């Protein structure tokens, strides 16, 4: 990748800067770094999945959903976009949408699904049940 050697190095540098910010709970800075990384190289779903996580840590779930949906569109075989979508939907009180997203994680990963991925799916399913049970007039 000679033509985009500078572009890719810069996008990955920005990504790493955003990841350090995320580790330090500087979610505002992480978001700005991931946003610049996407501008430099907009074909990498990881940057959108990372930005979705930062938005969710700030309880900015509408923006997290948008970024997760972008990650899914850019790489539909990448499970993490669906995990980020499911977390944001779950936190928004949309557990049926979260369940579908976490189920897709399990379908993608198949027999390679981790116990944490299974727990995510089961948590969403439980929240569907809880939400129904809590209905009042
Ligand atoms: O547009 B909302 O995510 O239902 O508030």
Author numbering: 92 to 228
Paper text:
In this study, we report the first high resolution X-ray structure of the Sgt2_TPR at 1.55 Å and also in complex with the PTVEEVD peptide corresponding to the C-terminus of Ssa1, at 2.0 Å. The TPR domain of Sgt2 consists of three TPR repeats, comprising six almost identical α-helices and a C-terminal “capping” helix (α1 = A96-N115; α2 = Y118-V131; α3 = A136-L149; α4 = Y152-I165; α5 = F170-183Q; α6 = P186-E200; α7 = E206-L225) connected by short loops and arranged in a antiparallel fold homologous to that of SGTA_TPR. A structural overlay with the equivalent human domain is shown in Figure 1A (RMSD of 1.13 Å over 135 Cα). All residues were built into the electron density map except for the C-terminal Val229 and the solvent-exposed sidechains of Glu93 and Asp94. The final model also contains 90 water molecules and a single BO4 ion from the crystallization condition. It likely relates to the fact that the TPR domain helices suffer a subtle contraction to enclose the peptide in the TPR groove. The crystallographic structures we have obtained clearly show a slightly more compact conformation of the TPR where helices 1 and 7 are closer to each other in the complex structure than in the unbound TPR (See Figure S8 for a structural alignment).
